[PDB]
DNA sequence: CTGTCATCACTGCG
DNA sequence: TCGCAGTGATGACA
């Protein structure tokens, strides 16, 4: 296998093929059948005093007798299904990392996206990386600094851009989520759905 | 309780 | 099609 090291200020990401094509295609097939999508209120945003869809659907899986915060709300996720444990054994086993919780995000096709943000959700244990892997299409992934967004920026930071490929792994390391801001834009040229999932250590 | 700070995605452009 | 500029109610925190 090989690894991307992604470096810039304050950023420190890895990137590899993580699943080959034989086995992502097998798990992307599993995720479509088995993964529950939130429904309701917790698909509900309000963004500068307007309510929106959230423009993706989203899930958590974990351990037993953990517990989030998601948007003012004590949740717990759901028990982990084969197919994720799957994953997080890979993704264990190749990088020695250890995760209790993951974050699914599912983008239908290239109108459903994330705006800049950080995973500074500090349920997180110190320092800990978060694991991202995608299964299915293609989309584009843009890293910003935090003192490069917004109209008239401190400072004029090159973004970092890369394609997030079906059965990648990106590995985003403190202290990525301090200093770099990351989203997944609109690509209206992506018809085809992806699933991504973003494994972390959260506090017990 | 009070005040500062960060936050999320849309519309309406160009 | 892409992406900038402008839009605030709400929770975290000390």
Same mark, same amino acid.
């Given at each position: 296998?090989?690894?991307?090291?992604?470096?810039?200020?304050?950023? #420190?990401?890895?990137?590899?093929?993580?699943?080959?094509?034989?086995?992502? %295609?097998?798990?992307?097939?599993?995720?479509?059948?088995?993964?529950?999508?939130?429904?309701?209120?917790? +698909?509900?945003?309000?963004?500068?005093?307007?309510?929106?869809?959230?423009?993706?659907?989203?899930?958590?899986?974990?351990?037993?007798?953990?517990?989030?915060?998601?948007?003012?709300?004590?949740?717990?996720?759901?028990?982990?299904?084969?197919?994720?444990?799957?994953?997080?054994?890979?993704?264990?086993?190749?990088?020695?990392?250890?995760?209790?919780?993951?974050?699914?995000?599912?983008?239908?096709?290239?109108? #459903?996206?994330?705006?800049?943000?950080? %995973? #500074?959700?500090? %349920?997180?244990?110190?320092?800990?990386?978060?694991?991202?892997?995608?299964?299915?299409?293609?989309?584009?992934?843009?890293?910003?600094?935090?003192?490069?967004?917004?109209?008239?920026?401190?400072?004029?930071?090159?973004?970092?851009?890369?394609?997030? +490929?079906?059965?990648?792994?990106?590995?985003?390391?403190?202290?990525?989520?301090?200093?770099?801001?990351?989203?997944?834009?609109?690509?209206?040229?992506?018809?085809?759905?992806?699933?991504?999932?973003?494994?972390?250590?959260?506090?017990?």
């Amino acid at each position: 296998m090989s690894w991307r090291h992604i470096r810039a200020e304050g950023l #420190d990401s890895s990137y590899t093929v993580l699943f080959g094509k034989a086995e992502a %295609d097998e798990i992307f097939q599993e995720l479509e059948k088995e993964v529950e999508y939130f429904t309701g209120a917790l +698909a509900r945003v309000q963004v500068f005093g307007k309510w929106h869809s959230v423009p993706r659907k989203q899930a958590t899986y974990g351990d037993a007798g953990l517990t989030y915060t998601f948007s003012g709300l004590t949740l717990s996720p759901k028990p982990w299904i084969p197919v994720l444990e799957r994953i997080r054994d890979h993704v264990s086993g190749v990088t020695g990392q250890t995760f209790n919780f993951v974050l699914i995000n599912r983008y239908k096709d290239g109108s #459903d996206h994330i705006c800049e943000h950080r %995973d #500074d959700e500090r %349920d997180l244990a110190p320092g800990s990386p978060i694991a991202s892997v995608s299964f299915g299409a293609s989309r584009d992934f843009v890293f910003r600094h935090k003192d490069s967004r917004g109209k008239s920026p401190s400072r004029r930071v090159a973004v970092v851009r890369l394609p997030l +490929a079906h059965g990648s792994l990106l590995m985003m390391n403190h202290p990525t989520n301090t200093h770099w801001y990351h989203s997944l834009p609109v690509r209206k040229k992506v018809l085809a759905p992806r699933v991504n999932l973003t494994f972390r250590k959260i506090l017990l």
